């Protein structure tokens, strides 16, 4: 399989161009568009990388195309752990979809936050707020594919199945890639000497949802999360041999680029994924 990486939440993790030139990642999620819905003007947060005002982040388009010519798919991640994002109604879902289409996808806008580059898809990292209308947002976005260029749909649900916020949306069967986050969740993450909970959870996910491929989401370093870190050796000799047997296995997802560099996680597991 391949490795999916989240980029954008630490200005010291390097440019998007550097990230893709490592040749270690197959998918890159730009985190995060953490503010939208309920009448709010959508706002993207890329930590210290750039300030979106006055097109301060339009420079990212260079990184996006650079990744894409290498065959790497780039998605804009909605939500994240911090933000006042939500959907107040079905109409709100439509408004946000149209916004995303004109500002990040194949539409037209005179103020595209990240530039004129056209992203491959939208990533759903909804962790709190409203539990409604996310399935509508998925449908409206998916409908734009009929205009020519496919809009990829990906999701990053928490490992407890079913997911309180993305369960309905994932049931639509419209998602291409799903990277389940097997961390910050005691009942389905790794615990020293115990891989039972994570394997049990994996089998539930790979047999319960209709998606293209499912990825094992993990923290790239002990500091990347409150709990759930899996040493590279344990992943390679105990977890991967089991989960790779599933025909739905797509690879591994890591949070995040910044911590991957410090811990050299992807460098240690790349050939085994
Ligand atoms: C897919 C998913 O759901 N992932 C979860 C992660 O979101 C979560 O990791 C934490 O994510 C939040 C964002 O949601 C992130 O917060 C960011 O923190 C950085 C560093 O402090 C801030 O960057 C600064 O921003 C200011 C102004 O914006 C700049 O002036 C300053 O220069 C920046 N500093 C640096 C060093 O760049 C961001 O502003 C802030 N983002 C937001 C939206 O407020 C946390 O840092 C992430 N925590 C960790 C440990 O990475 C993860 C937690 O384990 O869980 C995932 O599931």
Ligand 1 pocket test, pick from 13, 14, 47 with the greatest ligand atom count within 8 Å of Cβ, gives: 47
Superfamily of domain 1-273: Glycosidases (3.20.20.80)
Per the CB < 8 A criterion, the answer to whether 153 and 159 are in contact is no
Q: 190 CB less than 6 Å from ligand 1? A: no
Secondary structure (3-state) at 189 = coil
Question: Six-digit token pair at 58?
Answer: 């339009």
DSSP 188: G
* CB-ligand 1 contact for 225 (6 Å cutoff): yes
Annotated domain spans of the chain: 1-273
264 lines ligand 1 (CB under 6 A): no
Nearest CA to ligand 1 atom 42: 82
Mutating to test ligand 1, I would choose from 75, 80, 219 the residue with most ligand atoms within 8 A of its C-beta, which is 80
What token pair was written down for 229?
């870190």
Q: What is the dihedral of CA 25, 230, 163, 87, to 10 degrees?
A: -50
Residues 6+ apart with CB under 8 A from 111: 55, 103
**Bond preceding residue 162 cis, omega within 30 of 0:** yes
Any atom of ligand 1 within 6 Å of the Cβ of 47: yes
Does residue 125 have its Cβ closer than 6 Å to ligand 1? yes
Among the residues of the chain, which ranges form H helices? 16-21, 60-69, 90-103, 134-143, 167-171, 196-208, 232-234, 240-243, 257-263, 265-269
Which residue carries 């010519």 as its tokens? 69
Nearest protein Cα to ligand 1, atom 49: 224
If you take atom 3 of ligand 1, which residue's CA is the nearest one? 80
Angle of helix 134-143 versus helix 90-103 axis, rounded to 10: 40
Whose tokens are 């997802």? That residue is 253
Query: Measured between alpha carbons, how far is 108 from 100 in angstroms, rounded to an integer?
Result: 10
* Upstream peptide bond of 32 is cis (omega within 30 degrees of 0): yes
User: Which residue has its alpha carbon closest to ligand 1 atom 32?
Assistant: 48
**Ligand 1 centroid vs 146 CA: distance in angstroms?**
35
Report how far ligand 1's centroid is from the alpha carbon of 81 (Å). Answer: 8
CA distances from 268 to 69, 220, 263 (A): 26, 11, 9
H or E segment at 40?
strand 40-43
């Amino acid at each position: 399989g391949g490795i999916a990486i989240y980029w954008g939440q630490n200005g010291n993790e390097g440019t998007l161009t550097q990230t893709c030139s490592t040749r270690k990642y197959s998918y890159v999620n730009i985190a995060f568009l953490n503010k939208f819905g309920n009448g709010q003007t959508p706002q993207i947060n890329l930590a210290g990388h750039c300030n979106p005002a006055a097109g301060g982040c339009t420079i990212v388009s260079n990184g996006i195309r650079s990744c894409q010519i290498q065959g790497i798919k780039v998605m804009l991640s909605l939500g994240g752990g911090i933000g006042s994002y939500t959907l107040a109604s079905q109409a709100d879902a439509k408004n946000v979809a149209d916004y995303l289409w004109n500002n990040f996808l194949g539409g037209k806008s005179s103020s595209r936050p990240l530039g004129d580059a056209v992203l491959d898809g939208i990533d759903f990292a909804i962790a709190h707020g409203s539990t409604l209308y996310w399935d509508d947002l998925a449908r409206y976005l998916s409908a734009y594919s009929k205009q020519g260029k496919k809009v990829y749909l990906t999701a990053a649900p928490q490992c407890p199945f079913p997911d309180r916020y993305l369960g309905t949306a994932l049931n639509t069967g419209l998602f291409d890639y799903v990277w389940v986050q097997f961390f910050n969740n005691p009942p389905c993450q790794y615990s020293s000497g115990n891989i039972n909970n994570i394997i049990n959870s994996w089998n539930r996910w790979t047999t319960s949802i209709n998606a293209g491929k499912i990825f094992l989401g993990l923290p790239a370093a002990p500091e990347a999360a409150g709990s759930g870190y899996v040493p590279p050796d344990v992943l390679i000799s105990r977890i991967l041999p089991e989960i790779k047997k599933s025909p739905k296995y797509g690879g591994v997802m890591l949070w995040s680029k910044f911590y991957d560099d410090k811990n050299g996680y992807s460098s240690s597991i790349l050939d085994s994924v």
